Structure formats: structure tokens, C-alpha cells
Tab-separated table of C-alpha atoms and ligand atoms in Angstrom:
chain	number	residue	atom	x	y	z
A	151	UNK	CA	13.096	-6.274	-10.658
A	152	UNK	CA	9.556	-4.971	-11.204
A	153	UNK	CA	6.805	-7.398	-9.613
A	154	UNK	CA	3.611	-7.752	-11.032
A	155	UNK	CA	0.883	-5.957	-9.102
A	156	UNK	CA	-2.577	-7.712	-8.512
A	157	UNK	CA	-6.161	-5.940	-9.023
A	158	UNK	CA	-9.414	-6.638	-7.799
A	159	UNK	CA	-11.009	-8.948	-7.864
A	160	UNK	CA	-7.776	-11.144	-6.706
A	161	UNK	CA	-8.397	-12.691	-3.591
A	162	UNK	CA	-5.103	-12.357	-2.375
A	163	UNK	CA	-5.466	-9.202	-1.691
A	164	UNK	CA	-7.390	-9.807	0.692
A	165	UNK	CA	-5.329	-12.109	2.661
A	166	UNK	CA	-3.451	-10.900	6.174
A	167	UNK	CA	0.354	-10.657	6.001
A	168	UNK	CA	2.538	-12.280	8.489
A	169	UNK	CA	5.256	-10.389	10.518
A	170	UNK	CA	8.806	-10.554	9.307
A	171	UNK	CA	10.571	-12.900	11.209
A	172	UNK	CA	14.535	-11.431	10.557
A	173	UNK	CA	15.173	-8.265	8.061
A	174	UNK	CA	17.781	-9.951	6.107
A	175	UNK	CA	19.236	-9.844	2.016
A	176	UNK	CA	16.555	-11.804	0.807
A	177	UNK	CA	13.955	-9.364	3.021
A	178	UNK	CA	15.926	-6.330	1.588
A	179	UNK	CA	15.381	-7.406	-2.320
A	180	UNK	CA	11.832	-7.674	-1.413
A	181	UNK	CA	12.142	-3.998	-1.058
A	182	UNK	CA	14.513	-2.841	-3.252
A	183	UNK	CA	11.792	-4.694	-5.927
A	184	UNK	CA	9.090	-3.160	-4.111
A	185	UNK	CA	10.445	0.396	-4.294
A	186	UNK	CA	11.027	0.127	-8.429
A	187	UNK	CA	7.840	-1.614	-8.996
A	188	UNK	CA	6.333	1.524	-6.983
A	189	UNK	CA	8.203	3.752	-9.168
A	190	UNK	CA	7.409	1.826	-12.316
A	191	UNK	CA	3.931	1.713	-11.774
A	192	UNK	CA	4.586	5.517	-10.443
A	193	UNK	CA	2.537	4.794	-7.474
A	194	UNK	CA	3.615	6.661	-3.971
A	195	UNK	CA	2.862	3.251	-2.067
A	196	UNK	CA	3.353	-0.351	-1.773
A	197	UNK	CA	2.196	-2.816	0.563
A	198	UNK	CA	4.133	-6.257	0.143
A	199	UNK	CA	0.695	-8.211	-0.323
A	200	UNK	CA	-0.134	-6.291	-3.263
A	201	UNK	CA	2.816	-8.157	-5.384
A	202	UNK	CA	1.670	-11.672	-3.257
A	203	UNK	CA	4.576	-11.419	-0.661
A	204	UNK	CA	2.210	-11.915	2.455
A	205	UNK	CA	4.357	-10.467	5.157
A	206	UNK	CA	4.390	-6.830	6.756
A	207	UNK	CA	6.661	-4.809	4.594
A	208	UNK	CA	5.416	-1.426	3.246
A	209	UNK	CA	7.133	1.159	0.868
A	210	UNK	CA	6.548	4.740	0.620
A	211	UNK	CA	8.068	7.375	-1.730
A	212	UNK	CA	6.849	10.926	-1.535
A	213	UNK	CA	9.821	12.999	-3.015
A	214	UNK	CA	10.170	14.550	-6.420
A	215	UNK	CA	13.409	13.172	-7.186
A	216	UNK	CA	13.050	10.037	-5.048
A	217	UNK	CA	15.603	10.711	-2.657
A	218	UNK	CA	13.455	9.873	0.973
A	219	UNK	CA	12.201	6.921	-0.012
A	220	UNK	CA	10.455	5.446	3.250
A	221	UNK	CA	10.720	2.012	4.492
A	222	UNK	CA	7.961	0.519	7.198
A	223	UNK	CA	8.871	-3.289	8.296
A	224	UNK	CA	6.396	-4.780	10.850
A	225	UNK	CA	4.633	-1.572	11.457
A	226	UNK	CA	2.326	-0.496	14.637
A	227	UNK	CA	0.222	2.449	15.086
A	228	UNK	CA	1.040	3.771	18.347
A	229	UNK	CA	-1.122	6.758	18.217
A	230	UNK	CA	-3.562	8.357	15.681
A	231	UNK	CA	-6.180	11.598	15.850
A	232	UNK	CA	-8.105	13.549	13.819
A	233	UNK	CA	-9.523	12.926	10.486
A	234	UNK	CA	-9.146	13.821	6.977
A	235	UNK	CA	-9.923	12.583	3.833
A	236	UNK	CA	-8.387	13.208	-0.501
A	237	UNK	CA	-9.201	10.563	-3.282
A	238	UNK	CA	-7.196	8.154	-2.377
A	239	UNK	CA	-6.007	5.589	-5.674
A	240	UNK	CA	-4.167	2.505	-5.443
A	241	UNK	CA	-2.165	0.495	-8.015
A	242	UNK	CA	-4.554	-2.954	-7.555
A	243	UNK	CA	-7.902	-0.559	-8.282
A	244	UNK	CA	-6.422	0.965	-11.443
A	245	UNK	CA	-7.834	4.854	-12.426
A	246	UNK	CA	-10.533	4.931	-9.359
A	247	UNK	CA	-10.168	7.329	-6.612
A	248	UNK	CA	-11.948	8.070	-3.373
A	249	UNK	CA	-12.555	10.218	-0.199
A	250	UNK	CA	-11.957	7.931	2.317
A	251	UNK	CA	-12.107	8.791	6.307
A	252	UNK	CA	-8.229	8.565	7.687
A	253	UNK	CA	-7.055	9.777	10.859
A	254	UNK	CA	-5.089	13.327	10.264
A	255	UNK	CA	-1.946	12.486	12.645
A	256	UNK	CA	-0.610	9.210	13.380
A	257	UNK	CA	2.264	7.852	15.122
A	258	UNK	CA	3.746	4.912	14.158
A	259	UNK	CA	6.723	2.446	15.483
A	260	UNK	CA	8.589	0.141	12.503
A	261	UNK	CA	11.938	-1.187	11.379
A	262	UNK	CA	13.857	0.174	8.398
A	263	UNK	CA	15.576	-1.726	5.843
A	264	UNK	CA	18.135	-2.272	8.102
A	265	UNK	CA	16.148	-3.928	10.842
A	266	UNK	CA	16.627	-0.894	13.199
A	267	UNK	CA	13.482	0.248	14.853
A	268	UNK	CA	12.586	3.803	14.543
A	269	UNK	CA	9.509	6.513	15.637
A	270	UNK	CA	7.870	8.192	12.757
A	271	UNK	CA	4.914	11.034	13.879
A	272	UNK	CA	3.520	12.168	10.272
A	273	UNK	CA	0.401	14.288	9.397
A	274	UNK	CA	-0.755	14.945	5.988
A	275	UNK	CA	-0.417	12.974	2.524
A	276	UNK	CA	2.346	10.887	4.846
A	277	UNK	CA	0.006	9.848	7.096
A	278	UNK	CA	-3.226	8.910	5.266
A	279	UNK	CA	-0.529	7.060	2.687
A	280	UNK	CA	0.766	4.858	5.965
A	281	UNK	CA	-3.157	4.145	6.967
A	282	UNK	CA	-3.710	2.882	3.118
A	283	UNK	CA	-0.631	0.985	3.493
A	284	UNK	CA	-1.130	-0.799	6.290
A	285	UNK	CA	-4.654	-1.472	5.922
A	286	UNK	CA	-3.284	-3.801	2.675
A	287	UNK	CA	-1.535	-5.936	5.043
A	288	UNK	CA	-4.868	-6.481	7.241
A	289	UNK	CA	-6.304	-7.546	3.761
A	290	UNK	CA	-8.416	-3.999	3.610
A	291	UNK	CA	-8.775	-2.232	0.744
A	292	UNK	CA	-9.807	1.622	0.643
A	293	UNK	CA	-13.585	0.865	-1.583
A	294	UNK	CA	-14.492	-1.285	2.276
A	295	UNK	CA	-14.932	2.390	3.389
A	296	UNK	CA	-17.704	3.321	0.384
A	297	UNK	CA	-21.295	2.111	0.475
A	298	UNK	CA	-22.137	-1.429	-1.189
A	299	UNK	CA	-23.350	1.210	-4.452
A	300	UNK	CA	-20.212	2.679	-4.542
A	301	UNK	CA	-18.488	-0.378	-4.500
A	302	UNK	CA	-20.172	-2.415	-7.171
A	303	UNK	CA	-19.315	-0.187	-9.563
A	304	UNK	CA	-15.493	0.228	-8.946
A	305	UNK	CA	-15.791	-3.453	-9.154
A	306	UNK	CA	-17.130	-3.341	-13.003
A	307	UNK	CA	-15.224	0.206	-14.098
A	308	UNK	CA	-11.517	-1.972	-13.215
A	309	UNK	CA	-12.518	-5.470	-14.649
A	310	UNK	CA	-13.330	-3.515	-17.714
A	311	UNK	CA	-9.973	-1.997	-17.427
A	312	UNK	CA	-7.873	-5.647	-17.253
A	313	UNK	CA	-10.118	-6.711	-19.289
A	314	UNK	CA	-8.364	-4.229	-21.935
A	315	UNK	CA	-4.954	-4.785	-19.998
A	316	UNK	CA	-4.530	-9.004	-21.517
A	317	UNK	CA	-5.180	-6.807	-24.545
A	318	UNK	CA	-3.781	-9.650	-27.414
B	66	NI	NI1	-3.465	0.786	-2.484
């Protein structure tokens, strides 16, 4: 099933998402939703709390032909260095992008759909798509990085946007 995705202004999104307690069927239609709302939307990431499930589930699908799809369940960032930076979108702030400061390598520990911990090191789009992600589920979004200027307009280019979406 596709979820709906929220945009700013929703103040959900700014909520913090609680771990998940046992990776069972219902947690694993979270995510198989998740991962064809992603691809709907055609989006490379999904935190959960951008459809309003407020727990620590994250989907990621780089490839082509959407056969690597990425599953990160109660992730933790075990290591990170360097920086980098590409305009960054995200499916809640439709059509804006930014440069935003990520960490170039990162190392992260998570469980898969399966509820089997793994060890993922990633550099590159991977990694500055895991910092997005997980900064969702700490209620940050990436326009907290711009200056209050920057901001403020995002703000009014997207409402105009909805505003056009509830289009009647
Ligand atoms: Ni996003």
C-alpha cells in the first residue's frame, strides 16, 4: 500500500521516533509500504515518521532496477568522518534542494527486515542518504542546516506547492 507522505509545515515531522520494540509481520508491512510509497513517490529514502509511523525504521533504495533495496531498523552511527555536501531533496519539502554539510563516511549498526543485526560502512550518495534518514527520526529536517533566510522561503515556495496539490 502507498502511505501518504506529510510536508512542511506538519508538525509531525518534527516529532522523535521511538525504537522498535520486536521486528515482527506487522513491523515488516510497515516496510514493505514504506519501500512502494518510496518508489511511488520515486524518492531514494524514507524515514518511517515521514508517513506518521513514529518509530525508527528507515528505507533506502539506490539501484536502477530496485534490486538492493536497503533496510535500517533501530539504527546507530557508530562512526562518521569527513564531510561532503549535494542538494539534498526530500519527499515532505516537495521540488527544493540543498547543499547541506554531511559527514563523507559513516559507519552504522541496524537490524534488517528480518530483525538480524548487521554492520554497514558506506561513503558517498549511501552515506549522506543514511544521515538525511536518520536525522527524520530525531525530528530534523535538512532546511535546520540553512540560515533563517534560506529557510523562510522554502517554507512559502512548498505551501504554494500543496496549496496547488488539494487542487479541486
Ligand atoms: Ni527527506
Amino acid at each position: 500500500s502507498v502511505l501518504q507522505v506529510l510536508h512542511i509545515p506538519d508538525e509531525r515531522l518534527r516529532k522523535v521516533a521511538k525504537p522498535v520494540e520486536e521486528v515482527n509481520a506487522e513491523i515488516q508491512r510497515i516496510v514493505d509500504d514504506m519501500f512502494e510509497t518510496m518508489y511511488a513517490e520515486e524518492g531514494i529514502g524514507l524515514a518511517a515518521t515521514q508517513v506518521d509511523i513514529h518509530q525508527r525504521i528507515i528505507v533506502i533504495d539506490v539501484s536502477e532496477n530496485r534490486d538492493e533495496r536497503l533496510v535500517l531498523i533501530n539504527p546507530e552511527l557508530l562512526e562518521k568522518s569527513g564531510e561532503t555536501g549535494i542538494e539534498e531533496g526530500c519527499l515532505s519539502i516537495p521540488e527544493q534542494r540543498a547543499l547541506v554539510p554531511r559527514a563523507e563516511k559513516v559507519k552504522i549498526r541496524a537490524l534488517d527486515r528480518d530483525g538480524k543485526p548487521f554492520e554497514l560502512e558506506a561513503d558517498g550518495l549511501l552515506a549522506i542518504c543514511i544521515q538525511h534518514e536518520m536525522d527524520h527520526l530525531v525530528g530534523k529536517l535538512f532546511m535546520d542546516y540553512l540560515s533563517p533566510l534560506k529557510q523562510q522561503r522554502i517554507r512559502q515556495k512548498v505551501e504554494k506547492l500543496d496549496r496547488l496539490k488539494a487542487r479541486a
